[PDB]
Design a protein that fits this description.
- Belongs to the tumor necrosis factor family.
- It is found in: Cell membrane.
- Homotrimer. Interacts with SPPL2B.
- This is Tumor necrosis factor.
- It comes from Homo sapiens (Human).
- The chain is mainly α.
- The protein is built from 2 helices and no strands.
- The longest helix has 17 residues.
- The chain starts with a helix and ends in a 7-residue tail after the last helix.
Length: 33
């Protein structure tokens, strides 16, 4: 049974999507995989 952690685990996913945006905001434009 998944409790409140249900929605809490959703943050671990979006965390990667937010990094892409914040990446360009930091100025990480060089190697680029």
């Amino acid at each position: 049974r998944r409790c409140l952690f249900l929605s809490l685990f959703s943050f671990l996913i979006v965390a990667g999507a937010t990094t892409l945006f914040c990446l360009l905001h930091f100025g990480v434009i060089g190697p680029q995989r």
